[PDB]
């Protein structure tokens, strides 16, 4: 026995806040969180306690410390099959990572509609509010490898596998409502331009390099998604606080065969929230697993990620009613024109047991649809349907990837397909072909119908010549970027400016920066001028004179495009650093933690060393991390309670803690003598909005703090931060 | 016709300093650099200028912007083979990364021995000082994925492929002289313990988590290499400024049949230099590609990485003359007892053309030896021999990985092996077996001999029973960690204490921190008490009385174990930040640059925006990066010239640049009114060692600054940094 006497090696199997317990495989953490998919995985879950260590062939190992050798200082013998099996498995552990979205973090959960959608779709999983569909959701970045950092500036993926009674439906979306390019044929070109450059494989997790900006400068269709990426959309605070979108127009098909154009949305019930660039970038170094950690910890704490599924619905007769093409995936559908109808809720409530087996091996593919859904001619979606099947043949080693446990349907699957590498299913059917008489033609085709019917494509009319040609209706590149720009708040606009400015400064060939600045002048002159000024570029007369693109169907903005214009901040699951001293006023701390608890806000108690400190009244306070070990980057606000403030007053790390949080626009609260830290961040005696201060941490001081936290960041502080050396 | 008219898209094909030009593929950057291996790759190099865009079957493509569809808004057609070939290739770009050492950066070079070593080895590549051997060297971290960050704390790999006239020899070493474990059977245990934990795949690039320290606390044999990893050896400044070691005892075999034991060494001719922890961590965020970029840029500049091959040589009859077992890979051979004999020089002087083709596909394996070398019974080496062949079968797709161009021998290779996936060689031999008469038994066996002879193993005596048993002579864990500790300077000991303290503070289960502290108590009490204090742990009276381990063969220390005890700095290839203002005194700048050029030191000119500023006298100064864009982390020293200081005096970023460099112990030089910045880093009027100051940059402001850079960092500043909030 190697475990400690007191059992402190094993985390409690009950929900606990971030950092109170060691994290654990989801079935050991939350053994009674069940869904039909989790239950069906029980046939392959393997335990460990009380079992003998064995080879893979079931032979018990006596000595797992030593190779077999001739003499105890002799050569290793070829007949050591225990060593070789163990080393062979190790030698072959890795499989190819995903071509794109290789970095991702996943969890199990469930979906339930708010109401029957049978009027617009025959999809069985939307037929009844009491129908619960298990899901497995993987969130991801796009550019970086599986080992890259989470808080990069990038698009994020948001892929949901629905295990429905009528097939797996995979909704494979991103956190912006469009993509960079129009036609799938260009996907390898765009992806090669953004990925590490081929001679030296730099940079990882970054669009901030010559080839990306070269491609963008030569392909103005990219400008819309580039605006999204350069805004704070590209740096979410958490996968829980970002939107999701299918990107493409798909179709719903009802029992009568009527088709309705649909775009899919996921609305985060924790609201929208993003980092600021300096904080995100520094966070890639301080914790490159920050989002992966934050997701896994939210679920272990019972702060389940929740999203509302939304449909923007457009009748078939309305295909041509907008001044952009519905099938152009570089164009969004403003919610002011077509509202998002809220259709159901998805809740992510259990982490995987084994990351490699369930997350790394999961296969999501937008061609995985079910009766009641169909495709459109969107030329980016069309070519996707080829790729997500093809790519699995090397990534997951052959065509039986659907037999990998996480990928298996929970509903029946039977057909005449046979063999392939690592074939699991042993078919007993005398027939492997149809039509057959020898098994009475089973399994049999099923006619399309209102429920449990076979899949039939919507009989869309196709008229034209075989051509490699972009639709003329796709040839407008500037008006959606502008609509997005005009819908941002002024501080969101300034961060977009800073995102282009920072990125372009890392482009080595100056003519690329100039060409990009030209494209910005086609979108908005104020934007183009602001970025030009940060690059030392002067706009020419021609450029000052470029007529702005037209409004989108008469819209001069749509506030649903902003992260922050319409407040939807939720503090549950956020985190505050509390900076301790060696004699904390226990009364400040009691009230603080009580008020945070009431709102579901977590706390990490921080000090200049590990172990514990003792409060004025003798309460022993355990330390979660040092100031340097858990930087302000990792929290949403900072409180400094009263006590022996002299203990920390001269600590560089504790002062810097506050400077960093201040620079990144986080709320700061200072009680009693903690107000002496106002000097480090240059706050006037009379105080400032976003700095909470009081003689003690009374009820009012906490309400003020928690109000600021609901608004996420103190945007009004931005003009004070450039004087601050941090 | 998309290139700019002025040709500025194309990097100058001649040596230029970091940042002056875009980087490029080696064969375009340095077309005149050659060696035998680079010449032999010529048949697979593919050009591009003036060629048509084609399919892989050579069919010219007319439209590479669109898929083939029925009507320009219609569905994509299955008959578009140009689209499917291009997506198919993209879909299968990725191959499995290396189980360990997945993150690495590589270059071509050559090796030449100083003199014939024929008296001690018949290895052809060591036989003649005129004999030049091409090499390809890949440096790496160990734990993180291929997309993880460079400046992590980790062991580093240093692998060299020698393309000799008698076979490929791979010398597959690391940057410390030992390993964590004794027997290869445990390799998957240790590697699993250090790698991201299996439920959630966290943390990347870091040993700072519970499973690593649980294994260490249960396996004291690990403590030697842990000491190294926790010292500044764990965070080198550059692959150019670290040592390399083969780790194991191997044999040399001369023409007479005499065996001599040998341990391999690489000495960096640029000297030994490491980062400090806070700087290394933050740098994984600001530039996760910093070592890869630095290596590529040094070679493009002509600062070729150079290393001296050295041997520690022990006669067979001295096998048992030490306090430790020569075969135990957790033990080092102190240079005090067995000096390193210099053998030859290696220069890395060309970057690859394609990172994937040459770096990612390169296969190094220490079983690749040549006649004149042989193995020993080291039980970690012994097991390695199995792994590096086996692992290539999945990583590189089959047994023909030696035909991938980078892996090919430059010397003849002929045998009776056939077939296998992606077989390139087309064999014309009528025979595929021997003995044969039908091809007169060719290719033929060759007897061993003084040169050009067949491989024969040295006839070592083996005697004992078939056992899975550790040699008792390996059962001593603490003496080498202690010898390591006592050989370090007091500031190096401080950094070791801080590395244990930081990592252990991230271990969630406290009993594990306590168990590790109990292990440090067996090594050295001062070390153990200093880590304990940082962790709030108190040593027991029993722990305080642990007798220290014996010295190693009479040694109370060995200064060759310290990075810094014996100065060996070299400033060539280092970089200085120069913080500009809008009216720079140009006499200061001429003097600065002239002095830096004279020592081969680079400079990057930084401002608050990109573009240019104009000096007092109309000299236009191009700006390389912004203060935020190229942080102090990325440079070795900072110089602030005189001019309009009021321009930058209240710029937060400019002040913080100096505070960050100050904290990280970098030399800082201030001229004239730039002395105003002394207030931000809290320097007294009369000055301090490590801050160079004067009315103007002369003559001997530059000699002082450069003397400080030669010493690398200002260690004496350490007591001052805790105060500073940065
Ligand atoms: C034809 C090329 C192509 C096209 C144009 C796109 N994708 Fe894709 N995508 C792939 C080809 C691909 C892929 C190579 O097939 C991936 C990588 C590995 C895999 O399993 O699928 C993938 C992965 C992938 C993932 C990760 C799924 C996972 O977590 O495993 C997401 C979320 C998206 N894609 C989303 C999108 C969106 C929203 C797109 C446009 C609206 C888009 N992709 C266009
Ligand atoms: C028995 C397993 C085993 C053991 C005990 C070791 N290695 Fe290893 N090593 C492997 C099994 C392995 C490997 C799985 O075979 C790798 C990864 C994939 C590859 O091509 O080789 C590898 C890669 C690898 C690399 C990277 C090569 C490259 O750049 O591609 C280096 C530098 C080392 N190792 C160095 C060492 C050192 C100095 C060791 C002890 C002194 C050591 N390894 C012990």
mmCIF file with all atom_site columns, N, CA, C and O in Angstrom, chain A residues 357-393:
data_model
loop_
_atom_site.group_PDB
_atom_site.id
_atom_site.type_symbol
_atom_site.label_atom_id
_atom_site.label_alt_id
_atom_site.label_comp_id
_atom_site.label_asym_id
_atom_site.label_entity_id
_atom_site.label_seq_id
_atom_site.pdbx_PDB_ins_code
_atom_site.Cartn_x
_atom_site.Cartn_y
_atom_site.Cartn_z
_atom_site.occupancy
_atom_site.B_iso_or_equiv
_atom_site.pdbx_formal_charge
_atom_site.auth_seq_id
_atom_site.auth_comp_id
_atom_site.auth_asym_id
_atom_site.auth_atom_id
_atom_site.pdbx_PDB_model_num
ATOM 1   N N  . UNK A 1 357 ? -9.087  8.285  -25.570 1.00 0.00 ? 357 UNK A N  1
ATOM 2   C CA . UNK A 1 357 ? -10.084 7.293  -26.095 1.00 0.00 ? 357 UNK A CA 1
ATOM 3   C C  . UNK A 1 357 ? -11.405 8.006  -26.547 1.00 0.00 ? 357 UNK A C  1
ATOM 4   O O  . UNK A 1 357 ? -11.982 7.679  -27.580 1.00 0.00 ? 357 UNK A O  1
ATOM 5   N N  . UNK A 1 358 ? -11.848 9.001  -25.767 1.00 0.00 ? 358 UNK A N  1
ATOM 6   C CA . UNK A 1 358 ? -13.128 9.634  -26.063 1.00 0.00 ? 358 UNK A CA 1
ATOM 7   C C  . UNK A 1 358 ? -12.958 10.983 -26.843 1.00 0.00 ? 358 UNK A C  1
ATOM 8   O O  . UNK A 1 358 ? -13.710 11.254 -27.775 1.00 0.00 ? 358 UNK A O  1
ATOM 9   N N  . UNK A 1 359 ? -11.988 11.838 -26.448 1.00 0.00 ? 359 UNK A N  1
ATOM 10  C CA . UNK A 1 359 ? -11.875 13.139 -27.118 1.00 0.00 ? 359 UNK A CA 1
ATOM 11  C C  . UNK A 1 359 ? -11.006 12.912 -28.411 1.00 0.00 ? 359 UNK A C  1
ATOM 12  O O  . UNK A 1 359 ? -11.465 13.126 -29.541 1.00 0.00 ? 359 UNK A O  1
ATOM 13  N N  . UNK A 1 360 ? -9.769  12.444 -28.258 1.00 0.00 ? 360 UNK A N  1
ATOM 14  C CA . UNK A 1 360 ? -8.857  12.481 -29.418 1.00 0.00 ? 360 UNK A CA 1
ATOM 15  C C  . UNK A 1 360 ? -9.442  11.605 -30.552 1.00 0.00 ? 360 UNK A C  1
ATOM 16  O O  . UNK A 1 360 ? -9.360  11.990 -31.728 1.00 0.00 ? 360 UNK A O  1
ATOM 17  N N  . UNK A 1 361 ? -10.114 10.488 -30.209 1.00 0.00 ? 361 UNK A N  1
ATOM 18  C CA . UNK A 1 361 ? -10.597 9.552  -31.242 1.00 0.00 ? 361 UNK A CA 1
ATOM 19  C C  . UNK A 1 361 ? -11.978 9.927  -31.736 1.00 0.00 ? 361 UNK A C  1
ATOM 20  O O  . UNK A 1 361 ? -12.438 9.295  -32.687 1.00 0.00 ? 361 UNK A O  1
ATOM 21  N N  . UNK A 1 362 ? -12.657 10.928 -31.130 1.00 0.00 ? 362 UNK A N  1
ATOM 22  C CA . UNK A 1 362 ? -14.022 11.253 -31.617 1.00 0.00 ? 362 UNK A CA 1
ATOM 23  C C  . UNK A 1 362 ? -13.960 11.783 -33.043 1.00 0.00 ? 362 UNK A C  1
ATOM 24  O O  . UNK A 1 362 ? -13.052 12.563 -33.315 1.00 0.00 ? 362 UNK A O  1
ATOM 25  N N  . UNK A 1 363 ? -14.927 11.370 -33.898 1.00 0.00 ? 363 UNK A N  1
ATOM 26  C CA . UNK A 1 363 ? -15.025 11.828 -35.314 1.00 0.00 ? 363 UNK A CA 1
ATOM 27  C C  . UNK A 1 363 ? -16.358 12.576 -35.533 1.00 0.00 ? 363 UNK A C  1
ATOM 28  O O  . UNK A 1 363 ? -17.419 11.978 -35.402 1.00 0.00 ? 363 UNK A O  1
ATOM 29  N N  . UNK A 1 364 ? -16.287 13.869 -35.862 1.00 0.00 ? 364 UNK A N  1
ATOM 30  C CA . UNK A 1 364 ? -17.508 14.672 -36.078 1.00 0.00 ? 364 UNK A CA 1
ATOM 31  C C  . UNK A 1 364 ? -17.471 15.000 -37.590 1.00 0.00 ? 364 UNK A C  1
ATOM 32  O O  . UNK A 1 364 ? -16.372 15.165 -38.165 1.00 0.00 ? 364 UNK A O  1
ATOM 33  N N  . UNK A 1 365 ? -18.620 15.008 -38.240 1.00 0.00 ? 365 UNK A N  1
ATOM 34  C CA . UNK A 1 365 ? -18.661 15.254 -39.709 1.00 0.00 ? 365 UNK A CA 1
ATOM 35  C C  . UNK A 1 365 ? -20.036 15.839 -40.067 1.00 0.00 ? 365 UNK A C  1
ATOM 36  O O  . UNK A 1 365 ? -21.062 15.210 -39.803 1.00 0.00 ? 365 UNK A O  1
ATOM 37  N N  . UNK A 1 366 ? -20.071 17.057 -40.657 1.00 0.00 ? 366 UNK A N  1
ATOM 38  C CA . UNK A 1 366 ? -21.355 17.716 -40.974 1.00 0.00 ? 366 UNK A CA 1
ATOM 39  C C  . UNK A 1 366 ? -22.241 16.978 -42.026 1.00 0.00 ? 366 UNK A C  1
ATOM 40  O O  . UNK A 1 366 ? -23.425 17.283 -42.144 1.00 0.00 ? 366 UNK A O  1
ATOM 41  N N  . UNK A 1 367 ? -21.667 16.038 -42.776 1.00 0.00 ? 367 UNK A N  1
ATOM 42  C CA . UNK A 1 367 ? -22.417 15.158 -43.659 1.00 0.00 ? 367 UNK A CA 1
ATOM 43  C C  . UNK A 1 367 ? -23.234 14.157 -42.845 1.00 0.00 ? 367 UNK A C  1
ATOM 44  O O  . UNK A 1 367 ? -24.087 13.518 -43.392 1.00 0.00 ? 367 UNK A O  1
ATOM 45  N N  . UNK A 1 368 ? -23.042 14.113 -41.530 1.00 0.00 ? 368 UNK A N  1
ATOM 46  C CA . UNK A 1 368 ? -23.777 13.166 -40.677 1.00 0.00 ? 368 UNK A CA 1
ATOM 47  C C  . UNK A 1 368 ? -25.113 13.818 -40.287 1.00 0.00 ? 368 UNK A C  1
ATOM 48  O O  . UNK A 1 368 ? -25.189 14.514 -39.262 1.00 0.00 ? 368 UNK A O  1
ATOM 49  N N  . UNK A 1 369 ? -26.088 13.715 -41.176 1.00 0.00 ? 369 UNK A N  1
ATOM 50  C CA . UNK A 1 369 ? -27.412 14.324 -40.944 1.00 0.00 ? 369 UNK A CA 1
ATOM 51  C C  . UNK A 1 369 ? -28.433 13.220 -40.783 1.00 0.00 ? 369 UNK A C  1
ATOM 52  O O  . UNK A 1 369 ? -28.055 12.036 -40.837 1.00 0.00 ? 369 UNK A O  1
ATOM 53  N N  . UNK A 1 370 ? -29.690 13.581 -40.499 1.00 0.00 ? 370 UNK A N  1
ATOM 54  C CA . UNK A 1 370 ? -30.770 12.556 -40.232 1.00 0.00 ? 370 UNK A CA 1
ATOM 55  C C  . UNK A 1 370 ? -31.970 13.029 -41.001 1.00 0.00 ? 370 UNK A C  1
ATOM 56  O O  . UNK A 1 370 ? -32.025 14.224 -41.388 1.00 0.00 ? 370 UNK A O  1
ATOM 57  N N  . UNK A 1 371 ? -32.965 12.145 -41.213 1.00 0.00 ? 371 UNK A N  1
ATOM 58  C CA . UNK A 1 371 ? -34.154 12.509 -41.941 1.00 0.00 ? 371 UNK A CA 1
ATOM 59  C C  . UNK A 1 371 ? -34.824 13.667 -41.226 1.00 0.00 ? 371 UNK A C  1
ATOM 60  O O  . UNK A 1 371 ? -34.862 13.637 -39.991 1.00 0.00 ? 371 UNK A O  1
ATOM 61  N N  . UNK A 1 372 ? -35.270 14.711 -41.984 1.00 0.00 ? 372 UNK A N  1
ATOM 62  C CA . UNK A 1 372 ? -35.774 15.927 -41.406 1.00 0.00 ? 372 UNK A CA 1
ATOM 63  C C  . UNK A 1 372 ? -34.765 17.102 -41.600 1.00 0.00 ? 372 UNK A C  1
ATOM 64  O O  . UNK A 1 372 ? -35.116 18.258 -41.350 1.00 0.00 ? 372 UNK A O  1
ATOM 65  N N  . UNK A 1 373 ? -33.532 16.797 -42.010 1.00 0.00 ? 373 UNK A N  1
ATOM 66  C CA . UNK A 1 373 ? -32.497 17.795 -42.311 1.00 0.00 ? 373 UNK A CA 1
ATOM 67  C C  . UNK A 1 373 ? -32.030 17.529 -43.725 1.00 0.00 ? 373 UNK A C  1
ATOM 68  O O  . UNK A 1 373 ? -32.130 16.367 -44.208 1.00 0.00 ? 373 UNK A O  1
ATOM 69  N N  . UNK A 1 374 ? -31.506 18.568 -44.397 1.00 0.00 ? 374 UNK A N  1
ATOM 70  C CA . UNK A 1 374 ? -30.852 18.347 -45.682 1.00 0.00 ? 374 UNK A CA 1
ATOM 71  C C  . UNK A 1 374 ? -29.823 19.417 -45.964 1.00 0.00 ? 374 UNK A C  1
ATOM 72  O O  . UNK A 1 374 ? -29.671 20.347 -45.150 1.00 0.00 ? 374 UNK A O  1
ATOM 73  N N  . UNK A 1 375 ? -29.069 19.272 -47.054 1.00 0.00 ? 375 UNK A N  1
ATOM 74  C CA . UNK A 1 375 ? -27.988 20.252 -47.368 1.00 0.00 ? 375 UNK A CA 1
ATOM 75  C C  . UNK A 1 375 ? -28.484 21.394 -48.263 1.00 0.00 ? 375 UNK A C  1
ATOM 76  O O  . UNK A 1 375 ? -29.670 21.429 -48.613 1.00 0.00 ? 375 UNK A O  1
ATOM 77  N N  . UNK A 1 376 ? -27.596 22.304 -48.654 1.00 0.00 ? 376 UNK A N  1
ATOM 78  C CA . UNK A 1 376 ? -27.902 23.291 -49.690 1.00 0.00 ? 376 UNK A CA 1
ATOM 79  C C  . UNK A 1 376 ? -26.679 23.249 -50.578 1.00 0.00 ? 376 UNK A C  1
ATOM 80  O O  . UNK A 1 376 ? -25.702 22.544 -50.260 1.00 0.00 ? 376 UNK A O  1
ATOM 81  N N  . UNK A 1 377 ? -26.729 24.066 -51.641 1.00 0.00 ? 377 UNK A N  1
ATOM 82  C CA . UNK A 1 377 ? -25.624 24.162 -52.592 1.00 0.00 ? 377 UNK A CA 1
ATOM 83  C C  . UNK A 1 377 ? -24.488 25.084 -52.114 1.00 0.00 ? 377 UNK A C  1
ATOM 84  O O  . UNK A 1 377 ? -23.622 25.440 -52.894 1.00 0.00 ? 377 UNK A O  1
ATOM 85  N N  . UNK A 1 378 ? -24.480 25.513 -50.853 1.00 0.00 ? 378 UNK A N  1
ATOM 86  C CA . UNK A 1 378 ? -23.356 26.344 -50.380 1.00 0.00 ? 378 UNK A CA 1
ATOM 87  C C  . UNK A 1 378 ? -22.015 25.613 -50.764 1.00 0.00 ? 378 UNK A C  1
ATOM 88  O O  . UNK A 1 378 ? -21.802 24.475 -50.353 1.00 0.00 ? 378 UNK A O  1
ATOM 89  N N  . UNK A 1 379 ? -21.164 26.244 -51.605 1.00 0.00 ? 379 UNK A N  1
ATOM 90  C CA . UNK A 1 379 ? -20.048 25.548 -52.251 1.00 0.00 ? 379 UNK A CA 1
ATOM 91  C C  . UNK A 1 379 ? -18.912 25.211 -51.229 1.00 0.00 ? 379 UNK A C  1
ATOM 92  O O  . UNK A 1 379 ? -17.997 24.463 -51.559 1.00 0.00 ? 379 UNK A O  1
ATOM 93  N N  . UNK A 1 380 ? -18.943 25.822 -50.045 1.00 0.00 ? 380 UNK A N  1
ATOM 94  C CA . UNK A 1 380 ? -18.006 25.484 -48.966 1.00 0.00 ? 380 UNK A CA 1
ATOM 95  C C  . UNK A 1 380 ? -18.544 24.217 -48.241 1.00 0.00 ? 380 UNK A C  1
ATOM 96  O O  . UNK A 1 380 ? -17.812 23.235 -48.065 1.00 0.00 ? 380 UNK A O  1
ATOM 97  N N  . UNK A 1 381 ? -19.848 24.232 -47.901 1.00 0.00 ? 381 UNK A N  1
ATOM 98  C CA . UNK A 1 381 ? -20.464 23.054 -47.299 1.00 0.00 ? 381 UNK A CA 1
ATOM 99  C C  . UNK A 1 381 ? -20.333 21.897 -48.240 1.00 0.00 ? 381 UNK A C  1
ATOM 100 O O  . UNK A 1 381 ? -20.065 20.780 -47.790 1.00 0.00 ? 381 UNK A O  1
ATOM 101 N N  . UNK A 1 382 ? -20.632 22.094 -49.533 1.00 0.00 ? 382 UNK A N  1
ATOM 102 C CA . UNK A 1 382 ? -20.602 20.970 -50.474 1.00 0.00 ? 382 UNK A CA 1
ATOM 103 C C  . UNK A 1 382 ? -19.255 20.190 -50.420 1.00 0.00 ? 382 UNK A C  1
ATOM 104 O O  . UNK A 1 382 ? -19.226 18.960 -50.421 1.00 0.00 ? 382 UNK A O  1
ATOM 105 N N  . UNK A 1 383 ? -18.126 20.892 -50.396 1.00 0.00 ? 383 UNK A N  1
ATOM 106 C CA . UNK A 1 383 ? -16.866 20.193 -50.417 1.00 0.00 ? 383 UNK A CA 1
ATOM 107 C C  . UNK A 1 383 ? -16.500 19.627 -49.045 1.00 0.00 ? 383 UNK A C  1
ATOM 108 O O  . UNK A 1 383 ? -15.813 18.614 -48.945 1.00 0.00 ? 383 UNK A O  1
ATOM 109 N N  . UNK A 1 384 ? -16.937 20.266 -47.956 1.00 0.00 ? 384 UNK A N  1
ATOM 110 C CA . UNK A 1 384 ? -16.798 19.653 -46.631 1.00 0.00 ? 384 UNK A CA 1
ATOM 111 C C  . UNK A 1 384 ? -17.291 18.223 -46.617 1.00 0.00 ? 384 UNK A C  1
ATOM 112 O O  . UNK A 1 384 ? -16.678 17.402 -45.905 1.00 0.00 ? 384 UNK A O  1
ATOM 113 N N  . UNK A 1 385 ? -18.410 17.924 -47.313 1.00 0.00 ? 385 UNK A N  1
ATOM 114 C CA . UNK A 1 385 ? -19.076 16.583 -47.182 1.00 0.00 ? 385 UNK A CA 1
ATOM 115 C C  . UNK A 1 385 ? -18.032 15.515 -47.608 1.00 0.00 ? 385 UNK A C  1
ATOM 116 O O  . UNK A 1 385 ? -18.037 14.387 -47.080 1.00 0.00 ? 385 UNK A O  1
ATOM 117 N N  . UNK A 1 386 ? -17.153 15.869 -48.565 1.00 0.00 ? 386 UNK A N  1
ATOM 118 C CA . UNK A 1 386 ? -16.096 14.910 -48.967 1.00 0.00 ? 386 UNK A CA 1
ATOM 119 C C  . UNK A 1 386 ? -15.022 14.705 -47.873 1.00 0.00 ? 386 UNK A C  1
ATOM 120 O O  . UNK A 1 386 ? -14.604 13.579 -47.563 1.00 0.00 ? 386 UNK A O  1
ATOM 121 N N  . UNK A 1 387 ? -14.563 15.785 -47.299 1.00 0.00 ? 387 UNK A N  1
ATOM 122 C CA . UNK A 1 387 ? -13.401 15.755 -46.433 1.00 0.00 ? 387 UNK A CA 1
ATOM 123 C C  . UNK A 1 387 ? -13.567 14.986 -45.107 1.00 0.00 ? 387 UNK A C  1
ATOM 124 O O  . UNK A 1 387 ? -12.647 14.260 -44.655 1.00 0.00 ? 387 UNK A O  1
ATOM 125 N N  . UNK A 1 388 ? -14.699 15.178 -44.404 1.00 0.00 ? 388 UNK A N  1
ATOM 126 C CA . UNK A 1 388 ? -14.713 14.678 -43.008 1.00 0.00 ? 388 UNK A CA 1
ATOM 127 C C  . UNK A 1 388 ? -14.806 13.173 -42.989 1.00 0.00 ? 388 UNK A C  1
ATOM 128 O O  . UNK A 1 388 ? -14.478 12.565 -41.969 1.00 0.00 ? 388 UNK A O  1
ATOM 129 N N  . UNK A 1 389 ? -15.306 12.563 -44.069 1.00 0.00 ? 389 UNK A N  1
ATOM 130 C CA . UNK A 1 389 ? -15.239 11.086 -44.182 1.00 0.00 ? 389 UNK A CA 1
ATOM 131 C C  . UNK A 1 389 ? -13.815 10.564 -44.565 1.00 0.00 ? 389 UNK A C  1
ATOM 132 O O  . UNK A 1 389 ? -13.166 9.713  -43.871 1.00 0.00 ? 389 UNK A O  1
ATOM 133 N N  . UNK A 1 390 ? -13.290 11.156 -45.630 1.00 0.00 ? 390 UNK A N  1
ATOM 134 C CA . UNK A 1 390 ? -11.954 10.832 -46.132 1.00 0.00 ? 390 UNK A CA 1
ATOM 135 C C  . UNK A 1 390 ? -10.882 10.914 -45.080 1.00 0.00 ? 390 UNK A C  1
ATOM 136 O O  . UNK A 1 390 ? -10.013 10.031 -44.974 1.00 0.00 ? 390 UNK A O  1
ATOM 137 N N  . UNK A 1 391 ? -10.862 11.988 -44.307 1.00 0.00 ? 391 UNK A N  1
ATOM 138 C CA . UNK A 1 391 ? -9.732  12.248 -43.383 1.00 0.00 ? 391 UNK A CA 1
ATOM 139 C C  . UNK A 1 391 ? -9.602  11.155 -42.280 1.00 0.00 ? 391 UNK A C  1
ATOM 140 O O  . UNK A 1 391 ? -8.498  10.847 -41.852 1.00 0.00 ? 391 UNK A O  1
ATOM 141 N N  . UNK A 1 392 ? -10.731 10.532 -41.888 1.00 0.00 ? 392 UNK A N  1
ATOM 142 C CA . UNK A 1 392 ? -10.748 9.492  -40.844 1.00 0.00 ? 392 UNK A CA 1
ATOM 143 C C  . UNK A 1 392 ? -10.019 8.236  -41.241 1.00 0.00 ? 392 UNK A C  1
ATOM 144 O O  . UNK A 1 392 ? -9.575  7.492  -40.381 1.00 0.00 ? 392 UNK A O  1
ATOM 145 N N  . UNK A 1 393 ? -9.901  7.977  -42.547 1.00 0.00 ? 393 UNK A N  1
ATOM 146 C CA . UNK A 1 393 ? -9.223  6.782  -42.990 1.00 0.00 ? 393 UNK A CA 1
ATOM 147 C C  . UNK A 1 393 ? -7.724  6.765  -42.514 1.00 0.00 ? 393 UNK A C  1
ATOM 148 O O  . UNK A 1 393 ? -7.177  5.693  -42.095 1.00 0.00 ? 393 UNK A O  1
#
